């Protein structure tokens, strides 16, 4: 029907023209919990509310600090490639982390010692490209759609250093001298960037591997996240990839969280840095507790970016009928959380009772084992 | 049906879970014009995507620089009051401008010479409260819903100076000494703010007027915008209120624009300052031209805030079947625009022809008269 | 005796080594009102806690943004001159306002049209020197001690442009060419600044007046504040000097407030800008109400600087046996305040009653006339 | 010969590879006056050290805050147009001031009321375009070369809003609707900016004047600076144009200074704001006195930009055999200076003598009349 | 008697109302050394000049960047707890370092792997809590008073994340789901923070230790500083705790310095970072040498905070009859100093003589061994 911002004897009907569809998506913002209080920055933004760059071969859209100003340290691109299409050879100042949501793709990277890494990535796999190292993406026969995260919030995918753009803005006589060729031999170079372009599907990965005099890279730039054993608890699963297991991923730590219907990512905080979120599928709500009696609740669904500033308390509750699947992203060399339950469970029971004005019936339910996703009883 | 980010041979279908409802609201963002280019800051935000503060008597929600970071100089509150309900006597550093969308309300203000102004405001009326002067709002028998604009983007309606909050945080012995009463006589003062509270409807305006030894205020703090004669053109109407006619409104200039179906606010820019927008009803698109070959198109509908940074070129096209009604707001002492049509019409025809590579058939259609809203032929 | 931070059943004795003398000066900070709450910036600093620059002829010490960081827009110097001593001819970017606390002095200024103003200033008189105009101070037979206020908080009196410093760092051949003299004729110029130096007392003011071809300055740079009629109320007096009466004083508005024992500067705020304070004599306390349930109380006595950020609510209570005398300083072209009493007195009584949960016995005591200083009954 | 950084018994020969040509241009920087002292920001930059944008029809190069970081508030473009060539119709946020050094040009401007101003400007003439008003430049039969000054140091001439760029990034269907034409009628619009382009010479000015329903502009946007009577003194001339005589020029004040060989712009400072300089012809040196015993000397010649921060003491000495001609530019509504000579001349002689440790033989030479340019005797 | 700002033939008596008690505390500021010079930021602030938050169970007051703006990286709280009273379970972004001045207390901490550390701390002991890890303090039978230092100058103790505040602003249904309990079972949860609250004394430490499945923490969070062997020299003792011995203390390095009457902390500087100081007992003066001929002397006594910006030269002299005891605090992973004496002692004697214009009689007294506290002879 028609939701209204009314909670008991508080609030009133909306009397002006309104966005009913967005109101239906945001039930806990039109009607917040009575426990919310105070001014809190916006922690929510939809990729559907961004300009989509369309090219022959795919598209790209981004959520940056210009869209979500609380997220100064992290930005993200949703990129889509048709079968065989190429994201042009390029580099940038920022490190790049990726999660393959749909399909598969071949990536290349060459490091500062001239060593080559070429690999195929499928659904649930990651890559991480350190700052400044040059790379490319080419979708395979299913096409590909993936999430990129960059470790500077001011990033824009329109501002990468692309191979053909660099050459188009270098004097032809300098290019000729650089490679030992004539200007006539390079006369057919593109006059502008390609960025994303259609291409025939590549051959088998084994036939693309390039050998060289500098040997193999010491650590791989891809990771099979969903092939790892997750942390399993009553209501879902958590798969963690940070620099302790995905060795090259020095500036991005990540977790993929799945939350069954009727379950929730438990009350917790992160003692190391801010959390950046992407909602892959499902529907959620989250209250961010900001200290000094401040708290604000946000709604999220597929396509949304979320955020939790450093050490703010939070939970992520599935409020729908399907599994809730989201990413937790951190600009750090490791994942870390503190569980509210485990914290209190590891303290003397009478000390917790003195804080909460509750009795042994409550402290008896605390668990010294951390369960990141719990199920409603 | 199901829209897709495809434009001719560019783009592709979405393969990941997505927000179809938001995509349907943003057709020119999922599929932008081919004439868009480059990185442009976000210029669009919905009140439906904000936390609504619910109280006994109404609600308030806000769009600030924490939601829309391009808008550093202006912020806005959507406030609703039930019949008789009071927005508590308060003040703040920012000047406040208001447009009454629904219903009616009584306002009070007292200036720094102790002069009182009390007045009723109905649909289409404005008020403007200069910085720091204390005021209140009380809805009449229909209730009220209105848009507030404050001339600092960092404002928050949770941070005003309220009468009862001030008194609750002043020593009782100081309050007693201030007014010449005993502490017992003030023992029933509230212990916390009221902010918005239910109240019986007031009596007639004439019975509320307070006379005093300092006389009448020199200029009124309310304005009947829709009682003025608008600028009428083929496709709509523009009603302007700035410091040249609404004399007290020194830091906010405003225009209410109505655009018939099949019409558009013409191509123009503002030579004085940034534009802040509120979409009262209807559906629009706008391309913002940002210089250096950069342009980005945005979709808007009822409940949305928009923005155009200082001097960027723009138009506002009605893309729906109902009238499009929106506000243009400026932090300045006057409204000013330059019309692309009128500009070229006031130049030698051969000079315009040399720029545009078009002939007399085009310069013949230019108009030396400014028509802010034009109708498609 | 020995004060302790105990208020009823709250607080405890101090168990570590402590500053009992400062604790005795700050009773409302060691034991704040129970109505204080929350984090508020420091609003209090003593000239006695600053380095005093001693010279032959006097001294100078300063309180700047480096001492009191809330005061970004205003800084102050306490300067003392012995009889006849000269503060060297100099200029600076900042405008300068002054209050003569003790003694008397002769000032000079020359404007950008070459017009000269020379005048004597006594106790209770002011001067104001616009930005960049060059000036000097010479104490008369009693010596002089005065307060200077500069309209930039980053000012330092060690960084003025002094006549002899400029000449000492200009090539001698350029000085010679500038004035049409030989290098030998200027060989005795000082090699360094003088800043403050001893000198014989000057003659009568009438004998110093310099006539010139450009005529008299249009407005005087001195003002006899204490010769004006003050605003008198039950508990004290207020003398205001701003650009409406002290015409040249365009960027500094000022009030000298005297508060009898048992009286208080009433509850009020300023709707235009921040307040900077200097306590000339006596003892006070002030609570600053900072919005959102925040308030903090400060103690002041002779030699202290205070501050009230833009629009924060405040009062200034005399807590001693002698008159309390202080300055209110504003970076603006006029003085403005709103009185809490007068505000409520100019509203319908039942409307005030609905806010305060008090009856006609309270609204009957409100006054439509502003009384800046009230006396306890 | 070969200059060396040696001054008496100080300094030494240069032993590393060096730039002898630049050293010869900077004698007072390789060998500064012994009266210089301390760290002072760079105040000097050459247009010859900038990238020149070459187009069919002319060129443009710029000195901005990215070249000269002390100049945050002002930037400049040196622009050249061949006979008949057009600087494309455009606008920008910044106000624009211009001095015609060589040749002549026709300018157009249309204001926010649709009023047209078209005029020819010759050598020694100025124009001023207020913020955001659209304009164009077309050189006449001699071509034109001129200096532009913009009142924001972050300006870049590559970032203006150009007519054809705006249209190229606007949907064709929107352009068509805006003017009431078909998409086919506008199919020949340029696909990119023109910026500067060759064109046939225009006809007589009288034949270009466009009449309109909104009447004439109230104040002209051009000024004949060199037709005014200058301030004449022994060694040169000063022509001032600010908002008191060039009425539209509200944010830029200017003076053209000519200094004969053997003469100097006298010791002075500006009490209102920073000075920006352009050296049209000749050779100079200037010492900037920065307070606290700091001073640094700079050399300038044709093509150089200079700067003097707010209120710093300075002189400008001709150190060559030809006249020295330069511009003094200020971001303010008026020109103002204080003369060191006139300042001291308007004070009691014994008071000046007590400061300088000089006698009546020196104070006798002071002049109560201001002479901005003095001649060596 | 009555001190005056007179030094030989410089300075003068104070003629205006003044703070004699503060002047007596600041003899080297009312009458600085003649070797002081120039503008230097304030380096001194008293806890007695701060608002004291009083609660049932104790108090807390703070010195932050809002009080002492030079200290951007470090802030401090003086906290007092009555016997048995609890500082509520909480966490914050900042790391926390502590020195127990009086009494004793029990601390708890749980890390991000769920491991528990509980320990008692007495006079002269330290703790260090890494960023974001949750902790509590409970005073034992003597009560406790201690100094906290946080590694961000913008910290405020009013802004921690407290257990009961978080729960009070979390929906009850979410808390219930998180722990697997009913809303009725948690109905008695507090509605607001406790912060500090009275409580019965705890039992023996051994009975509070909580065992768990994740084992012991790898490094302890407490340190017995005064049980270590100090660096002993002629006039006092230095006890150092940094990350090389107090292993967890990664962002705070510390030294406790005791200076006998007639002794001084020698002339030295720190090559790694800024110094933050707390004066536990006694009376001192310190000159800070700031480069470029700038130096300023400050007085300190019990309860004062001091500061020395990165690498500035300094000494700390005992100017009283009792021992001087103070803390040196650094935001770094190690303590480092350079001794002026040891520096010169480790250079060729004739090279030092050429610098100082002194002979072998001076270089003969230099010591190659570092003596941090020397005694006057
Ligand atoms: Mn990339
Ligand atoms: Mn999390
Ligand atoms: Mn308001
Ligand atoms: Mn507009
Ligand atoms: Mn001065
Ligand atoms: Mn006040
Ligand atoms: Mn221009
Ligand atoms: Mn000048
Ligand atoms: Mn803590
Ligand atoms: Mn030290």
């Amino acid at each position: 029907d028609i939701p209204q911002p009314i909670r008991g004897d508080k609030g009133a009907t909306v009397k002006i023209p309104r966005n009913i569809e967005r109101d239906r998506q945001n039930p806990d913002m039109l009607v917040p919990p009575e426990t919310d209080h105070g001014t809190v920055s916006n922690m929510k933004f939809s990729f559907s509310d961004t300009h989509n760059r369309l090219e022959k071969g795919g598209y790209a859209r981004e959520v940056t600090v210009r869209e979500l100003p609380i997220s100064e340290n992290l930005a993200s691109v949703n990129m889509r490639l048709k079968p065989g299409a190429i994201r042009e050879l390029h580099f940038h100042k920022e490190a790049e982390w990726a999660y393959m949501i749909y399909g598969s793709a071949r990536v290349t990277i060459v490091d500062e010692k001239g060593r080559s890494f070429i690999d195929d990535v499928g659904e649930g796999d990651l890559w991480y490209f350190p700052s400044g190292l040059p790379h490319s993406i080419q979708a395979l026969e299913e096409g590909a759609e993936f999430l990129l995260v960059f470790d500077d919030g001011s990033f824009s995918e329109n501002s990468t250093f692309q191979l053909t753009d660099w050459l188009a803005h270098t004097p032809k006589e300098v290019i000729a001298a650089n490679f030992g060729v004539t200007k006539e031999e390079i006369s057919n170079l593109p006059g502008k960037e390609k960025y994303i372009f259609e291409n025939q599907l590549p051959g088998s990965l084994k036939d693309d591997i390039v050998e060289g005099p500098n040997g193999e890279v010491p650590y791989p730039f891809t990771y099979r996240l969903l092939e790892q054993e997750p942390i399993e608890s009553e209501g879902g699963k958590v798969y963690i990839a940070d620099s302790t297991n995905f060795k090259v991923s020095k500036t991005i730590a990540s977790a993929l969280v799945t939350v069954e219907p009727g379950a929730m990512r438990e009350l917790h905080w992160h003692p190391n840095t801010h959390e950046w979120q992407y909602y892959i599928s499902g529907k959620a709500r989250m209250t961010v507790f900001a200290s000094d009696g401040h708290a604000r609740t946000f709604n999220y669904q597929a396509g949304d970016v979320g955020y939790v500033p450093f050490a703010m308390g939070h939970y992520v509750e599935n409020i729908g009928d399907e599994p809730l699947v989201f990413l937790e992203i951190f600009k750090d060399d490791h994942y870390a959380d503190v569980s509210l339950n485990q914290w209190l469970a590891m303290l003397p029971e009478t000390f917790v009772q003195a804080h909460l004005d509750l009795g042994k019936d409550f402290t008896d339910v605390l668990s010294k084992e951390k369960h990141p996703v719990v199920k409603k009883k």
Side-chain angles (χ1 to χ4, degrees), chain A residues 1-215 217-228 230-374 376:
Chain A
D1 208 57
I2 305 304
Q4 298 288 357
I6 294 168
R7 188 177 67 235
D9 57 9
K10 295 181 186 178
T13 55
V14 183
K15 289 286 191 184
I16 63 179
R18 61 189 291 203
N19 197 321
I20 299 265
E21 293 87 359
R22 278 177 201 239
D23 286 348
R24 283 175 191 138
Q25 296 193 346
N26 298 335
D28 300 281
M29 305 176 74
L30 190 75
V31 183
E34 70 177 345
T35 42
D36 278 14
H37 180 261
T39 302
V40 173
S41 286
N42 179 49
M43 309 293 180
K44 159 198 171 68
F45 205 91
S46 180
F47 274 102
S48 288
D49 287 319
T50 68
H51 162 96
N52 208 354
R53 178 176 177 172
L54 312 186
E55 301 290 348
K56 301 186 183 191
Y59 63 71
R61 48 188 176 183
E62 61 191 20
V63 176
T64 75
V65 73
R66 300 174 294 279
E67 288 65 57
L68 183 62
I70 191 69
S71 184
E72 298 191 344
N73 65 336
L74 289 158
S76 181
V77 172
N78 169 195
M79 180 167 286
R80 163 84 151 99
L81 292 175
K82 295 169 66 185
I86 295 166
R87 172 70 180 95
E88 177 181 354
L89 285 159
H90 72 271
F91 52 97
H92 29 70
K93 301 186 302 291
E94 294 81 4
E96 167 176 329
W97 181 99
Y99 180 85
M100 184 66 50
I101 304 166
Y102 164 86
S104 58
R106 183 159 308 161
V107 296
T108 75
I109 186 170
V110 175
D111 68 16
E112 78 281 4
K113 303 293 162 213
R115 302 175 294 204
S116 168
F117 179 88
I118 304 181
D119 195 30
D120 285 349
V121 289
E123 289 171 9
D125 295 349
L126 319 181
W127 67 73
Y128 177 94
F129 301 148
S131 77
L133 298 183
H135 51 273
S136 70
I137 315 155
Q138 180 173 21
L140 303 189
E141 70 282 343
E142 292 295 337
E145 188 160 11
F146 42 94
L147 186 84
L148 308 174
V149 182
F150 304 89
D151 63 356
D152 188 326
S154 303
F155 179 83
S156 182
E157 189 78 19
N158 292 332
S159 280
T160 72
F161 302 87
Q162 288 159 130
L163 171 56
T164 57
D165 196 20
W166 187 8
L167 289 170
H169 291 93
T170 305
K172 280 293 184 66
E173 63 192 357
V174 169
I175 302 172
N178 192 74
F179 293 104
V181 300
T182 64
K183 288 192 288 188
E184 182 275 329
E185 285 172 272
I186 57 176
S187 55
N188 206 47
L189 281 169
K192 62 162 290 264
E193 74 176 1
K194 295 190 174 198
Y195 180 74
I196 288 173
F197 56 108
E198 309 266 30
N199 198 265
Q200 180 178 319
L201 287 164
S204 281
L205 173 63
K206 74 172 171 73
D207 294 328
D208 274 2
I209 305 311
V210 178
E211 312 266 320
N214 289 108
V217 299
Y219 296 98
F221 296 92
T222 58
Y223 193 80
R224 328 292 175 192
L225 181 59
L226 291 192
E227 293 182 16
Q228 314 302 309
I231 302 164
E232 281 179 80
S233 48
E234 266 219 278
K237 293 164 160 47
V238 179
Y239 304 77
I240 296 169
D242 64 16
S243 90
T244 71
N245 55 344
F246 187 13
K247 291 299 172 48
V248 294
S249 187
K250 295 291 192 343
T251 71
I252 295 287
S254 63
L256 177 99
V257 185
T258 301
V259 181
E260 285 311 295
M264 67 181 339
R265 178 81 175 87
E266 68 166 346
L267 286 161
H268 72 284
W269 73 97
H270 302 288
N272 56 335
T273 187
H274 320 284
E275 177 174 325
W276 184 98
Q277 306 177 329
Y278 179 67
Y279 288 82
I280 297 170
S281 58
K283 296 172 177 182
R285 71 176 178 172
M286 162 174 72
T287 305
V288 177
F289 172 64
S291 90
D292 189 31
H294 284 57
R296 186 163 294 192
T297 299
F298 298 89
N299 288 111
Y300 304 92
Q301 58 184 76
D304 284 342
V305 174
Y307 205 79
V308 185
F310 183 12
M312 294 197 175
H314 57 290
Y315 66 92
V316 191
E317 178 182 10
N318 189 343
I319 61 176
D321 294 326
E322 308 294 329
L324 160 66
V325 183
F326 65 98
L327 290 168
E328 308 167 330
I329 303 295
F330 309 83
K331 193 179 172 176
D332 202 9
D333 64 1
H334 68 288
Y335 182 98
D337 65 344
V338 185
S339 158
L340 172 60
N341 194 327
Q342 186 180 52
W343 173 27
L344 304 181
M346 291 299 300
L347 295 172
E349 56 187 4
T350 63
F351 192 63
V352 174
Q353 290 165 16
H355 278 76
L356 302 183
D357 305 332
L358 304 173
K360 176 172 229 274
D361 284 339
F362 178 80
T363 50
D364 278 353
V365 314
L366 301 170
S367 176
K368 300 181 174 177
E369 191 169 79
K370 184 181 288 174
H371 303 116
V373 187
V374 298
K376 293 173 191 4

